[PDB]
Design a protein around this ligand. Sequence first.
Ligand SMILES: [Mg+2]
Ligand SMILES: [Mg+2]
Ligand SMILES: [Mg+2]
Ligand SMILES: [Mg+2]
Ligand SMILES: [Mg+2]
Ligand SMILES: [Mg+2]
Ligand SMILES: [Mg+2]
Ligand SMILES: [Mg+2]
Ligand SMILES: [Mg+2]
Ligand SMILES: [Mg+2]
Ligand SMILES: [Mg+2]
Ligand SMILES: [Mg+2]
Ligand SMILES: [Mg+2]
Ligand SMILES: [Mg+2]
Ligand SMILES: [Mg+2]
Ligand SMILES: [Mg+2]
Ligand SMILES: [Mg+2]
Ligand SMILES: [Zn+2]
Lengths: 143, 78, 130, 132, 195, 36, 177
Amino acid sequence: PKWYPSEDVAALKKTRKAARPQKLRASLVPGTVLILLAGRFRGKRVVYLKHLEDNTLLISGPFKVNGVPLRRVNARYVIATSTKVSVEGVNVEKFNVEYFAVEDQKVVDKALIAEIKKTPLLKQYLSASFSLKNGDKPHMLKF
Amino acid sequence: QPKIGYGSNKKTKFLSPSGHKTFLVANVKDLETLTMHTKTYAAEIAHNISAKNRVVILARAKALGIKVTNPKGRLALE
Amino acid sequence: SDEIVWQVINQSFCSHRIKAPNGQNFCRNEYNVTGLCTRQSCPLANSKYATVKCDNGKLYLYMKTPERAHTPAKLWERIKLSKNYTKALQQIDEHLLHWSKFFRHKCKQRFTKLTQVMITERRLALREEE
Amino acid sequence: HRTAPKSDNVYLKLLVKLYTFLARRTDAPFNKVVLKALFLSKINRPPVSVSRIARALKQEGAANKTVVVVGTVTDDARIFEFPKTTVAALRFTAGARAKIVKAGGECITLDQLAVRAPKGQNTLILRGPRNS
Amino acid sequence: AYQKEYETAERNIIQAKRDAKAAGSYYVEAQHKLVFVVRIKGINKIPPKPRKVLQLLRLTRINSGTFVKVTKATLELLKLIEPYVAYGYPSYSTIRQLVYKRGFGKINKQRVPLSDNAIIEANLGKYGILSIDDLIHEIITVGPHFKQANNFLWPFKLSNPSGGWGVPRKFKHFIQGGSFGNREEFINKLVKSMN
Amino acid sequence: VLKKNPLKNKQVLLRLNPYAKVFAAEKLGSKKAEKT
Amino acid sequence: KIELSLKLVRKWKKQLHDSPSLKLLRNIISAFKVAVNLNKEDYKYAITDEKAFHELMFMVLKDVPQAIQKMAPYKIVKGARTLPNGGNVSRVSSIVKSHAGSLLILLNDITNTETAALVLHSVNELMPYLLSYRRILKELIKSIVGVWSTTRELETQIASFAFLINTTKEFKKSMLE
RNA sequence: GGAAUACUGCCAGCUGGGACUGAGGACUGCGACGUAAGUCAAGGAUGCUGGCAUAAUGGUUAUAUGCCGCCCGUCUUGAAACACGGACCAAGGAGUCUAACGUCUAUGCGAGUGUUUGGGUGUAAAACCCAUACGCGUAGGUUGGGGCCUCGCAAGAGGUGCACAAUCGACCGUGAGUAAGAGCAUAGCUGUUGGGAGUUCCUGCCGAAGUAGAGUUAAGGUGCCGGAAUACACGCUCAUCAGAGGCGCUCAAGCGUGUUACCUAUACUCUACCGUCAGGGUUGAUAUGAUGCCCUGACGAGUAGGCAGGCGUGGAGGUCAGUGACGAAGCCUAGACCGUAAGGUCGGGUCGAACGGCCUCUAGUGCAGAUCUUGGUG
Ligand SMILES: [Mg+2]
Ligand SMILES: [Mg+2]
Ligand SMILES: [Mg+2]
Ligand SMILES: [Mg+2]
Ligand SMILES: [Mg+2]
Ligand SMILES: [Mg+2]
Ligand SMILES: [Mg+2]
Ligand SMILES: [Mg+2]
Ligand SMILES: [Mg+2]
Ligand SMILES: [Mg+2]
Ligand SMILES: [Mg+2]
Ligand SMILES: [Mg+2]
Ligand SMILES: [Mg+2]
Ligand SMILES: [Mg+2]
Ligand SMILES: [Mg+2]
Ligand SMILES: [Mg+2]
Ligand SMILES: [Mg+2]
Ligand SMILES: [Zn+2]
């Protein structure tokens, strides 16, 4: 109170806007392969592990397969393909949002590779990048 | 074609891009009427003021902390 | 007669009034706290009134009451606000006890601004002395 | 009709301000009626003579009522006996004022009536004949 | 109570039709006692005789519309303004949607929106109507206070139909192949597109 | 200040009509008339 | 919000002359910032006594450079005053970077010779930190040129130009162009 | 016999993708759910993440290169063009004061009202005051009835009754009636009659016979200029009169007849904004002129006609203890700011001695064209 209020302070009206947990798109499910459309790893195929509280999807390359480390990715900048891997092998509880502010990636990668081996040619798929060739129309293209 | 529908909003009317309404000032006494309304108003020295008076007005305005719209006019050009 | 005086001053020549480009009016009256010609503003319009006004280094408080409406020479009682800002606000509130909130709020704001102006004119005119 | 008196008289405007405030803040329709009357032009404010006041009081049960005339009251020498009452009106001619004072009555402005009867209790409004 | 009444009334009409057919005797429905009218034509190039009628029906602009009680007196008024308006029998669903979305109440001639039951109560409790749905019942039926409830509602302001007007040319009568005229139940198709 | 359409916002819909809540649970709109 | 008291300024000056610390410098500079921004604009400090304000201005302009030099003593190299390499210098450098535009506002608000001389001297003892910046070194040389350009006192102009020579001839690299 | 599907209709049935809007600024209300406490999508957007500057960029100016246009007026579409006309420069350039009656408004007085017909007085036409006359004025019954009183929480029960009306009558002298008058004077605006007697500063408003975003849509249109299918389906027609803004078109880009889709307006819906109107709130005083502030709603085309509000130009009174060689007034200013605009403020230039702002009353806004005339030039 060391200064009397010069002019006046207009208090903001109370806001009836409570934040609620996000409702993700139906295609996104744990163990779903993803295509990243921007950033350092744009056009690179990655695996989906879990959805964080702050609405940043968590993804692993695996770094072993394609050199993409554990990372947070925005959901809207990602395409979801119809091919899946079982994520039950990897537990994915410890690492969280605040944690993001090598050994863990190795632990995750061993379990995820274990499931990757069963499906044919999946490692090659995750290794290679994606791009649009001439004559490719996305709207028909089933991803 | 001019017409009333083009009229500007009252809350934004008569406002410079700096956000200060321009008020004409002739002498120090008229400057002092804008002592606290520094946020709402900015002073503008009249065209007919002599150079000797303009420096005094500018000094008093700086002391009061009132924005002058046209300083360095007739003390500098443009 | 304050209402009559105000109505004449409003719909006739308030010589201290200046019509700004926006349409807002400013009374030039030195005693005026709020330099805007209104019902609550013209010291001429209102019998009960107060203002902070600077004389030399001091920031005096001027009081106006209907009792001294006659004898305008002695009308404005002069009170010295203490240099301590907190003490000054306390003295203003005390003297303006049971006094309409408009004049009290405006008086406090004017005291704050005049104190800042005194500080900053001390700033602009700092000299080698002391 | 009007929303404010066309006259530029300061005192009429003050009375209009008081009565519009009362009509806004009083349930009684009396304040509304007098407020609407205050706006009227001279032709629509015919003079109500002391004669009409005498008739209005002769009506049964109205002897002690405060007669109200939004306008001017004029004397009438036709009468010799005039009862005592506290007429209220905007203006009073010298003859009418003398007649009211002489008979023990008294004349008040409409502000004094508002102080007396903010809800217009026991009031009797009168209006002059606007034949032409 | 109103919901049960509506369901029972509809089932009763259907059952009466089925029973009459089974007996071999025709069934005739009671003539509809309510119509909804909508303005189709601009004010210009209108004679005085239809112009005065349009004022009575509370229609002052194109695409506005209102409910009208069906009587021998009122039917001839519609006949007078046949070129410039399109009208038909409104179903319950259309009236409900109109009242909920575009409903506006006349409170001291100030077109107050009907956003709360209290607003309707303060005006129409004198007539025993305390909610939006009570008003909807008074409208869908011809109640003892239909005039007052209908007059309380501000004339509806409707957008042009989303799908379109149907026929390429509007200004012919409904059978001739144009928008204006008595189209009866099909008004429900139009109004829902407009609302 | 703003008009909230009952059809799109359930809260105001319930405010205008309480019986709408019960009717939604009952689903009388999709009720089955007896086959008879 | 702390209120400036004639006690608090006295204590800050008391511990300035003996064993100052970066916390004290940031506190002093923030108070200085409020002092210079009173007419032209959250702030931790409030100013109410003219004695406290004048004492703050005095001690700041006349001794905060002294403490700054003592913490991070520059060394004369090829005629130029250059700071050394070290962490402590960098911390002090951000502190002078938090004092510079208060000096700029004072420069833009010069009205007489002695105030010009004091501001220019305090600015003089803070070149070696502000040569590392170009929003400040430019506006510095732009402001004092502004003073050298707009003053009507020949002594003020002489002081401004003498400052320009003394600072320019020392360094010649960042400023002279 | 068993049904299914199609169509129509309803759902206060779910769930997905788009686009525009984020208006409001302590709380109050209707609500919803919560055992409860509290919470919320319930009377207008908040939260999370990232970056946040010698930048992002923005302005001015100059060459060279090529494309198009290219005497002037009018005309023209939407626009150059095109269709129609053109000795040359400078000017000047189509009538006046005043009266009679009447409506409305404001002020003063009031059965009155007006003075000035004269005189006194006078820092002297004045201002202040007296008479002196005449002018124009004066010479009930009942029902309803705004209002006020009682009872009533309220609806009502009544009681009483302004103006005025309704009929009912008395008297005076069958109405202008009386039975309880209003006029006079001044000023403003203004209707008519008159005495010689082309357009019209800007904005708004009322009315015979609006700005911006989103969506929808009429009239129309979907070869390109140009935004939309060179889409479909029929019947035709290419005629030496084929047939329709420009270019162009001929199994049409020509017709008539139907189908959808699509483009979009001063039209309709929602929002925000600006104006006019209307209804409101607000004083043992407002955090800014109760002619203020605030809330809510409706409308904005409008021809004939009518009304208001602003801008600018002079005259006078008052005022800003206004402005001025450290530069007043006047003029210009493809500069900055403001206002929807008429314009205003400032900067600069020019100018070189005085003038402006503001309250009041009083005068008073820019163009067109003809007869031609004169000088001057062919
Ligand atoms: Mg100028
Ligand atoms: Mg008269
Ligand atoms: Mg009687
Ligand atoms: Mg469409
Ligand atoms: Mg819809
Ligand atoms: Mg609204
Ligand atoms: Mg949707
Ligand atoms: Mg009578
Ligand atoms: Mg009677
Ligand atoms: Mg629009
Ligand atoms: Mg559109
Ligand atoms: Mg307020
Ligand atoms: Mg209207
Ligand atoms: Mg109109
Ligand atoms: Mg003058
Ligand atoms: Mg000019
Ligand atoms: Mg503009
Ligand atoms: Zn004033």
